[PDB]
Amino acid sequence: AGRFTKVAAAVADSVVTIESVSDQEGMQGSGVIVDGRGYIVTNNHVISEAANNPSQFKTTVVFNDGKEVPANLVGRDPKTDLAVLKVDNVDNLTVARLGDSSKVRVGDEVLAVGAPLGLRSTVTQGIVSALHRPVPLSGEGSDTDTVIDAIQTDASINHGNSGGPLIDMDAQVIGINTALGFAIPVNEMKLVANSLIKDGKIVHPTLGISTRSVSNAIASGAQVANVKAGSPAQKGGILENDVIVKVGNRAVADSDEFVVAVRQLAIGQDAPIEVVREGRHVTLTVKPDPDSTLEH
């Protein structure tokens, strides 16, 4: 058999269909089996409309054999476009082999695996085009738009493999497909899934700043469009018109890298912010708040 046929066939039992149906609605996506207890990882937008209307929506998981089993929302993260589901007492579960997104290199051949039984299911072929690429993602329901540090791939990422794993040539998951194709790295997924399984929620850093992208000589980075009153930004000396060029130990090229850089900051730990103010370079100190206070 073929090199790609072998890998895709080896991971098909760990990939599942996720259907969220209602009286006048019927979303569908793909997921992956990450734990033998019934733990399934998908993206937030696949199940966003359902989590927001649990009264009218019902979610199920369709496996490779065809068994449709009820599923329960463990926890979701609109910030990383990630979500966990749980199927109860389902046996003989084929669990995906989780790989290391840190060892992933540009040019690495990959497969974007969709669920074999899904309506418009797709299995795509390509290579890793870019590592650590800040990418904006649209929020499905009432969910907020975010940006993620993704693995970029020339393999087609579409409705048919969205939520499904991004697999290497070793039949290991290195990422979850999103909605010119991108995937949430597995190393970030393992961190978000761990908090979403345990606490049903992930806490992310917040600073209270809105940024617009700027690229003009010295002023190349994220320009402060708005400051929130009482924000760690206001306490830190941050102003409008200001161009953020470094957040922590990470340079900020634009609004996209800013959102990602803020989320790599430690919660409650003082952090360096470097801005270009009215032509002058200025370092400001900010302590990051929890986005969810009663959950920190």
**Boundaries of every domain in the chain:** 3-87, 108-199, 205-295
Helix or strand holding residue 243 (H, E) = strand 243-247
Strand-strand pairing, 181-185 and 39-42: unpaired
Q: How wide is the angle at C-alpha 48 spanned by C-alphas 42 and 49, nearest 5°? A: 135
Residues 164/15, Cβ–Cβ less than 8 Å = yes
Helix (H/G/I), strand (E/B), else coil: 34: strand
* Active-site residue, selected from the candidate residues 14, 20, 30, 45: 45
The verdict on domain 205-295 having CATH code 2.30.42.10 is yes
Torsion over CA: 178, 180, 186, 191 (sign): negative
Residues 46/29, Cβ–Cβ less than 8 Å = yes
Residue 292 annotated to the active site: no
Torsion over CA: 295, 53, 80, 75 (sign): positive
DSSP string, 202-229: ---EE--EEEEEEEETTEEEEEEEEE-T
Q: Which of 282, 286, 208, 278 is nearest to 245 (CA)?
A: 282
Q: Which residues pair with 289 in a beta bridge?
A: 206
Residue 162 annotated to the active site: yes
Residue 170 annotated to the active site: no
Same fold, 3-87 and 108-199: yes
Residue 236 φ/ψ region, left for φ over 0, alpha for ψ in the -120 to 50 degree band, beta for the rest = alpha
Q: Which residues pair with 41 in a beta bridge?
A: 32, 84
* Active-site residue, selected from the candidate residues 143, 162, 254, 255: 162
Domain 3-87 class, CATH top level: mainly beta
Quick one: 108-199 is in which CATH superfamily? Trypsin-like serine proteases (2.40.10.10)
What are the E-state strand segments in 103-216? 109-113, 123-137, 146-153, 165-167, 172-177, 181-185, 205-206, 209-216
DSSP state of 294: G
Helix or strand holding residue 235 (H, E) = helix 232-236
* Active-site residue, selected from the candidate residues 20, 30, 81, 149: 81
Strand-strand pairing, 97-98 and 172-177: parallel
| φ, ψ at 216 (rounded to 5°) | -135, 85
